[model samples]
Structures are given as C-alpha cells and as structure tokens.
Target: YNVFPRTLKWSKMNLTYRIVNYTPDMTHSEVEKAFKKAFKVWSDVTPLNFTRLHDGIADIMISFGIKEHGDFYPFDGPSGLLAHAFPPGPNYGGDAHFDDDETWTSSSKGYNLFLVAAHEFGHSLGLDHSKDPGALMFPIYTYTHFMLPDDDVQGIQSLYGPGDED
Candidate 1:
C-alpha cells in the first residue's frame, strides 16, 4: 500500500496529453470534457497543470484499447480491468488506457470515465495503492465524488508537497 517510494513525481509542473481516440459509449467531445475535468480534479489539488495536445509527443497519452492492443499489459474484454495507467517516466510513462469494450460514460452508468480516469491518473502521477480502502488508489473501485480521500491527498502531497488546503 502507498507505493510512493517506488516511483517518481513529475519534475515539471505543466504536462501535455492527447486523447488519441474516444470510447464508443461517449461522444468525442463528451470524453474530451469529462477527462479534462478529471485532470482538473487532481490539478486543483496539486501543483500540476494538464494541457491538451492534438499532435506530437505528450507527457500523457490517453486512448482506448482492447485485448493486446500495444503494451504487454493486455486488457480483458468487457468486464475486468476497467483501465490502467503507467507510472511517470519516458515513452509509455503517464499514458492512460481504457477498456474499449466497457461502456465508458460521463455519468454513473457503465464505469464512470471520470472516476476511472482520476484513479488511473493518480497512478500516472506516481502515488500507488494505499492501505486505506477509501483511497482512490486502493487497487479496487471506490468512487470518490467531489473530492479524493484524505490519505490520497496526504500521500500525493508528500510527493508534490502540499496542495490546496482542504
């Protein structure tokens, strides 16, 4: 639990990302706004700022893939492993992937894209599974609406320093 020591926090404050593709369950614009909103949930808490990118390389590369898409970590179709993200670094670092077979939605139906992205992005940013089950990084689904877990905030703060006082 709380695997912060295993990874590194981003050295830069501003990071770029690209949504290479959209999930079929939501419109492109919907996923666009929803994921950015997801990023804001973290940004509002830390010193990080996420920017959208249309081309070229990005610090975070997001998209949907099913089965053995690209990374050796293949996604199971439809049900398990809702999504995953790599810890920060080079090449695949910071990239987030969603299971295309799942009904990724902006709302609670299917698996909430915002919830999954926020959790996955947490992994991308360096923090890992927390001993606290209520945490967003608990290695299992526990929806955190409006805010993240206190332990999550504390753990991330340890890496990036203090965030918004709350």
Candidate 2:
C-alpha cells in the first residue's frame, strides 16, 4: 500500500462530497449507496468523516464522464480506465470521475460500482496505488468481498491516524 504524498491529505477530519451527476448504467440510489459504503470504508479506519451534499459545491465533487470531460484526464471508455480521482485539497481535489461507458453495477458482473468507488475514494483521500494485490488500493480491478484489507487500513491510518477509539 502507498499514499500520494503526506501533504495531499485533507487537513480536516470532516469532509463533504457532492455527486454532480449520475451514470446512465445504474439507478440513482445504487450510485449513492455505492459511494456511501465506499466512503465508510475510509471513515471506518480513519478519523475522516464524509457527508454527502445534495446542493452547492462540496470539498469532493463526484460525477461521470465519457471520453473527454472537463479535466485533462479523459475516460478511455469501457474496460480501460474505469475511474480516476484527485488527491485531497480544494477545487478539483477530492473529486472522483467514473467512465460512463463502463457497465456499472452493484453486482460482481460487469464492474461493481461499490468496489470501484471504494478504490477511487482511496485516491480521493490521497492514497496511491498499492503493490499488494489484496489491497483495495491495488491498480487492477478484481471482484472481491466488500472489505478493506489490513494493508489499506494501515495505509490510510498512516495519513489520518486511527478512527475513533473503540
């Protein structure tokens, strides 16, 4: 497991995110649930807490795009480049973009939005790809149970410290 940089993480534990748009592939609620759970994965390990915003600009902006979008990183469509995200900061920072061309799903078939969002949210939180194959931060996509590996837990805690004492 790895991180983008020490300086890239959000200084505040409380962060807000807004979904600017939804993909055509999945229902709106599914998208919301997928992201909610994904965000929880990090919050479960760190002091960081995520709140979803229905209106106005938020710290993290979530959306879907096909091919060329607003940002320099364009979606390659379908199998390649399922999604990408910016490190924690202002403006585009903390934003996550998904490829609309991909058949997003809640199930293991096609691509699982929950898993993909969890991975991308890792990037949004300033985590980089992990060398550990079992880690959620791994660059490659694989269908697995919705849980964060120990490597990912340690990686995130290294940035934000451990979650509330229990």
Candidate 3:
C-alpha cells in the first residue's frame, strides 16, 4: 500500500458526492451504478460512508470532461490518461473528472468504468498509486471484475481505520 507524498485525506467519515455530468458513452444509470459500486468498494473496507447528492455541492464532485475543462491538468487523448481525481481539500478537492474521449463501457469491451472509477475514488479518498499492480490503486488500468486487495485494505485502514465488520 502506498500514499501520495502529501498524504492528503478527508477529515470526516460521512461524505457526500454529486454527479455534475455524465459521459455519452454509457447510460446515466450505468455510470451512476459504476460510481455507486466504486464508492462501495472503499466504504466496505473503512468506516467511511458516502451519500449521493442529486443537487447542491458535495464533498466530492464527479464529472466527465475532455481536454481542458477548467482544471489545470487536461486529459490526453485515448489511452494515455483515463481519469484523475483531487486529494481531499476544498472546492476541487475530492472531485473526480473522467476523460470523455475514452470509450467507457460497463463490460470488458472497452475501458471498464467500474474499475477506473474505483481507482479514481481511491485517490478521492486520499490514497495514492500503489506499487502492487494487483491493487486497485495501482497506476495502470486493468480489470473487469473488482475486488479489494489486502494492500488496499491496510492502506485505507491506516488512514481511516477498519470498518464495522471487525
């Protein structure tokens, strides 16, 4: 398990998130489910709980954008960059932006939305890229079915402690 040098993280356990926009590649429900399950991945392992806000600002604001969309880091075309998220902070902090240029899919056909979203949310939750390729927090994009590895569990537990499962 590895964290970014800064070690930025959310200060609270209960967090809210909002979907600012959707990608044209997948259905709104599909995208929503992808994010829902992604958040569940982390919440299941930590005490953190995430709520979806249909309106108003939330701790985490999610969107699909192409190239420069106001943020300083613009996504590259195709496979170079899939998505990015900010560390815990105000405004852009905890926000996640996906590259609409990629052919996001719910299956293995293209880049799996669930896998990528889970990875991005790891960053949103303050986890950095893991050196272990098997971890969801790994810097590479590779997976269809999702499962939280022990490395991720320890990483999150280190920051937020273990979940209620004991």
Candidate 4:
C-alpha cells in the first residue's frame, strides 16, 4: 500500500553516519557492518558515497528501539511498523530508528537490519516511499538487499545529483 507520495530528493554527496551501540542483540561493530553493507548497496549502484564516523557526530545516527524515542513518529512494535527516520537537519534530523520488538537479524527470517537501514537512510536523505515495488524507497519491507532500480536511481540522483561530482 502507498502510505505517502514521493516529494523529497536526496543529494549525491557522501552521508556521514554512525551506528550507536544500542541494540542488545548485536554488537556496535556488527550493526555498523550491516549498516555499511546497506549503504554500499546504494553507493555501488550510484556515484554516492557513505562514510561511517568513528568519532564526533555524524550526519546520520542509527539506533534501535521502540515507541517515542525522540521524534513525533513512534514505532508500533513487532510487525505493525518496522522502523522510521527523519530527513536531513540538525540533531534529530538524519536519525534512523528500528523496532527492537522484532527480532533484527542479518538473515532472511527476521527483519534484516541491512535492508531496513537502507530504506531509512533513503528517508534520512530526503527520499520518500515509491509506489513501484521494485524501487528501494518503497514504504513496506520486502526483505530486499539488492541494487535499486532505474526509477530509484533517477529519483535519488535528481535530489543529490550524480555521485561522481565529488
């Protein structure tokens, strides 16, 4: 189902982000590695780059939790809502949250952090859900971890420009 229309565009620049040591099931490195894999999927397809932060603040902060962490949108837990994130901005902006209620796994059975992180990152960068099922910006989770389609590439490129600019 289409929850919202695609209205925002993302920049092609490298998005600096970090995975906070929050998830109880996974280590910080594990989460970071999954996140890198997720970000790489987009970078490999496009010219965009994703740099993970080691110290200091990052453009995007990845976290795992449930219901009303710090944003207007609260996770519904389990399968109702998988996760959510904010558009680029200060503090709360560019932050992505996951529903810890559901088992987050790197495997196919549970919700894959890699897949969900990529989708939330798209939102953090300003891209919204796409009506096309093949698009990476789709609202609902399909446990996908492949390169985005031409529509996704065009949409993201339109906002962030070609990643080759840098």
RMSD per prediction, one decimal? 4.0, 3.8, 3.9, 5.7
> Tens-digit lDDT track for model 3 on 15-113?
999999999999999999999999999999999999999999999999999999889989987879899999888999999999999999999877888
TM-score of each: 0.90, 0.94, 0.93, 0.82
Angstrom error of the Cα, residue 126, model 3: value is 0.8
TM-score, model 1 to reference: 0.90
What C-alpha lDDT do the candidate models reach, one value each? 0.84, 0.91, 0.89, 0.75
Instruction: Write out the backbone clash pairs for model 3.
Output: none
lDDT of 4 by residue, 1-166 (tens): 7654355433336678877656776677668778988787667655666788876788788878788777787888778888888886778788888988878877787888888887887788777889988877877788642666777777667666665544
User: Candidate 1 on 14-75: residue-level lDDT in tens?
Assistant: 89999988888888888988888888878877888899999889999998999998998999
Residue-by-residue lDDT tens digits, candidate 2, 1-166: 9755546789899999998999888899999999999999999889998999999999889999899989999889779889999988889999999999999999989999989999999999989999999999999998965678999998899899997957
Better of 1 and 3 by TM-score: 3
The lDDT leader among the candidates is: 2
> 165 in model 3: Cα distance from truth in Å?
2.2
Q: Candidate 2: count the clashes.
A: 0
Question: Higher-lDDT candidate among 1 and 2?
Answer: 2
| lDDT score, candidate 3, position 55 | 91
